[PDB]
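Notes to self, C4b-binding protein:
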Amino acid sequence: MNCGPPPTLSFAAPMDITLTETRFKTGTTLKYTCLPGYVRSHSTQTLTCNSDGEWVYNTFCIYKRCRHPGELRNGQVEIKTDLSFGSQIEFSCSEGFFLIGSTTSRCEVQDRGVGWSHPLPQCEILEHHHHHH
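result:
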């Protein structure tokens, strides 16, 4: 008695287990990894044949990024992690300006859909200038 060929997990992806097999019986256990974008949810990552007719398991890794704060006028938001919950993103005010507001920005989550705390800061010109006599 097998659980049937392992389905497709949109909330993960194969990591090993030579797919040269067809059955795995109960008690068996796969690997599976979590694509780039999942956050606070790490607690497991295995598919075991249960006594239901398929593979049971937890929702390890949960995809929930934060909407891009947008373009930093007179600046360059330090983005890279696609804004995955549980991250900090700095900023950078161009030459004739400096950073003010919060050089850091943490990715938070509220209810269900992630909830930014603060976006772009404030880029204001310095107190020194030589473009005019």
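- The two ends are 87 Å apart (CA to CA).
- Residues 1-63 form a domain with the Complement Module; domain 1 fold (CATH 2.10.70.10).
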